[PDB]
Amino acid sequence: MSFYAALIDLLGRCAPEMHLIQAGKGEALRIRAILRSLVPLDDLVGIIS
Amino acid sequence: CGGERYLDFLRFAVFVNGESVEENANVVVRLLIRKPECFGPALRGEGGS
Amino acid sequence: EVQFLRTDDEVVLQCSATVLKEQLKLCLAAEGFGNRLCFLEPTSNAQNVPPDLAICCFTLEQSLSVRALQEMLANTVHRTLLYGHAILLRHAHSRMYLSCLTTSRSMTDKLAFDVGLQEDATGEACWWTMHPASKQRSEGEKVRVGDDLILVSVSSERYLHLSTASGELQVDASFMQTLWNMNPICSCCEEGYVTGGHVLRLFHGHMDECLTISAADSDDQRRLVYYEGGAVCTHARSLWRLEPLRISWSGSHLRWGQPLRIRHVTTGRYLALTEDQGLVVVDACKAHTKATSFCFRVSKEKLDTAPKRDVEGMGPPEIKYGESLCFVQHVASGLWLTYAAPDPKALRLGVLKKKAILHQEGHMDDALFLTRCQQEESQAARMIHSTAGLYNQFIKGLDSFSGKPRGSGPPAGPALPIEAVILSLQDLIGYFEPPSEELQHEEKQSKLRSLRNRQSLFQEEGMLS
Amino acid sequence: RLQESISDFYWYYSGKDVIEEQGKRNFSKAMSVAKQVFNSLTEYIQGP
Amino acid sequence: HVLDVGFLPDMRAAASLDTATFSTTEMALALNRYLCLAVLPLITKCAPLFAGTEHRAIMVDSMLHTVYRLSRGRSLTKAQRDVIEDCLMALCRYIRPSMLQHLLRRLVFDVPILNEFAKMPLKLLTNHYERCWKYYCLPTGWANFGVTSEEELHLTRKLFWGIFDSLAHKK
Question: C69, C76, C169, D12: which sits with the fewest CB atoms below 10 Å from its CB?
Fold first, then answer.
C-alpha cells in the first residue's frame, strides 16, 4: 500500500503544471490523456470509500 | 523497500518548489512507460490484473 | 549498389514474426472505403497462396524535420530524405493516409491505440518519423534500403508492434519496440514504359475486339473468357492486373521471361490452364506457380535457352503502350492462347462470340498491344470488386440460417459485419454525392461527365439484381 | 553535423522576428566556428 | 466525493482523548478541506451536507484532540465558503451554527461562528427567502448575546472592534 501510494503521488505531482499552460499546447493534453488512460475510473473513489 | 525508496526519491526530484518542470516530467514519463516491466508489471495491471 | 530511395517512391512496410517456428516475412495491408483496420497477409509464402500486392502499397510525399513539421501544423493557411525525419505514408489505392485511432481492442485495456486510415491530412496523428534501429548507423545519415526501420507517429510517440494475445497477427501501437523491415517496390515513373503491378487493357486486332469475361448472372460461372468486340472496349470488365511473384522490386520494367500472374480486378481470381477444361479461371485456393505463371516473348520463336536478365535495377527500355505487338506463351506448357474460331454458330449471334482456347498451331494473328488504364477506372473496379465481395459475404451470412426461428441464444454460427457494412455504405454515399452548383461551368460539366462514367462502369458490372 | 545543427537552430527561430542577446551570441559563436573550419579546409585543399 | 468523505467520520472522527492511538488524519483532513475550498460543487438541491456541517461545527467548537492552528484556520475558511456559497438550501444546517453560537458566547474558539453569523445577513439581507424558523430565535438570541457581551463579558476594545456584529435582520 505504501508503494502504491508513493507511485500515485508521483504520478499526481507529475501533472503538467495547471490549466494555465494546458490550453495553449498539446503536449500537456497528451500527457493528461496518457495519465488518465493508465489508471481507470471508479478506483480512487472506491479506495476512499 | 527498494521500490518504496526509489519512489520516495523520485517524488522529491519533480515538484522542485511546488511547481512542475515539464521537461523532467515528460522525460520521466517516457522513461517509466518505455519499459512495460516497471512499477510491478505482474500486479499493477500490466500482466492482466 | 545503394538504393537512392527518393521521397516519391512506392514503399511497402513489412516485418518478420515467429509464431509458427518459421522466419517468414509479413507486410501491412489495408482496404479502401471499408473497415479502417490494418490486416496482414502472407506475402513471403507465396508458393501456396496468392499474395495481394494491391492494397499494401504506400506512397511518400514529403520529408521534413520535426520542427519544420510543427511550424507547418502551427500555421497551415524529388528530393532525398534524412535519418530521423517526418515521413508521409499515403495509400495508393484511393489516396488515404496512415493514422492512429483513439480506440481500444484485443481485450487488453490499458493502452491499445488501434491504428487505421484517415480521409484528410490535417496533421496530428498522421505523420511518421524514423529512429535509429541498428547501431551500425546513426541519425543524420543517408537512409539505406532494408536493414530494418522504426516508425513513430509525431503527436503520439508510439511504436508499431504486433499482438501477442489470442488475436492472430494484429498490428497495434504501444510503447514496446518492434523492428520493421523496409522493402521498396517501385521507383520514379517512366515516359510510357511497361511497369509491373499496373493494370492493363488487353486488345485484339486494331480497334475491333478485346479480351474479357462474360457478364455476371449468366448461364454458368464466369470461367469462359470469350472474345467480345467493342461493346466492352471502354468498360471495366476488360481489365487485367499483372504482378510478379518475387519479393524484389516489382515496380521495375516488365522484361521478357519474367513470371506473370494475371489477376482479375473484379472477381479476384487468376487465369491459368488446368489441363482439364482449357483456358479456365482459377480461384485463390489452387495457387500453383507451375501453371499460373506466364511470360512475354518476341515473334513466335522459343529462344529461351538459359535464363537471363535477373538484375535488381529498373532494366533496359522495352515496348511502350500501343507501340507494337506482344506475344504471350505459357512458361511450362509453351503454347499460344490465341483464338480459334472454328465455325460461326447461329445460336450465339453476338457479332464477335469466339471462345479462347490454346493450341500449338496458332493462327499467325497474335496481335496484342498494351494500353494504359486510367487510375480512376482501376480504383472504381477495385471498389466494385470489394463491395460485391462484402455483399456476397453478407447474403451468405444471412442465408446461413433461414429456418431456425427459435432464438435461445443469438450466437448460432458465423457472425456478421454490421458495423463494417454500415461504414461501407456511408462511404459509398459520401462518394456518390453529386456536386453542388457554385463552381465554373466547365468544372461542373467535367464533374457530371466523371459521375456519368462512374455510374456507367457501375451499371456494366451490374450488382442490381 | 554542424550544418544540421545550425539549420535546426534556424528552424527554432524561423517563426520569430526579434533575436535576443543569447540567440545572437550563439549565432556569432557557431558562425565563427564554421568560418574557422572553412579556413582549415581551404588550407587543406590549398595548392594543386 | 463530498458525501463519501462526509459519512466516514462521525463527530469529528471521535475527537476525544480515549486512546490517542493514531493522529495522522490531520493531513488528510487538510487536503480534502483544501479540495472543498478549491471547488464549487454545492449548486443544485438534494445535498446531504447536514452531517458534514454538523461534524465541521463539532470540530471547530469542541477542539479536544491536540492543538493545531492551521486546522482551525482552514476549517473556518471552509465554513465561510460554505455559508457564502449555499443560499438557503438547508434550514437546520443554518439553525445549528446559530444555536451553537447563541448558546456558547464569550469564548475563544467561537470567533469563526460569530463572524460567519454576522456576515450571513450581509449576503442574504432577507432576500429570496421567507422563513419564520430563523426569526423565532434570531432577535431574542441576538439580544441575549449582546447583553451577555455587555455585562457578563469584560472584553477588551480590540476584541469588540474585531468581532463586532451587526445582525440587521429586523423586518
Answer: C76
The DSSP secondary structure of chain E, one letter per residue, reads -HHHHHHS-SHHHH-SSS-----THHHHHHHHHHHHHH-----SS----HHHHHHHHHHHHS--SS--HHHHHHHHHHHHHHHHH--SS-SHHHHHHHHHHHHS-S-SS-HHHHHHHHHHHHHHTT-S---SHHHHHHHHHHHHHHHHHHHS----HHHHHHT--------
- What's the rounded Cα separation, in Å, for the pair E101 and C29? 76
Pairing of strands C327-330, C294-297: antiparallel
Residue with cell 517501385: C186
Q: Do B4 and A3 touch (CB under 8 A)?
A: yes
Counting as contact any 3 or more CB pairs under 8 A, the partners of D are C
Q: Do the Cβ atoms of C241 and C265 come closer than 8 Å?
A: yes
Rounded CA separation E88/E120 (Å): 11
Q: Do D11 and C140 touch (CB under 8 A)?
A: no
**What is the Cα–Cα distance from C121 to E75, expressed in whole angstroms?**
54
* Residue pair E121/E169 in contact by the 8 Å Cβ criterion: yes
Partner-chain contact C65 D1, CB within 8 Å = no
Is residue D20 annotated as involved in ligand binding? no
Cα separation, C72 vs C62, in Å, equals 12
- The distance of B41 to chain C (nearest Cα, Å) reads 12
Burial E108-132 (b: 16+ CB within 10 A, else e): eebbbbbbbbbebbeebeeeeeeee
- C261-264 and C128-131 strand pairing: unpaired
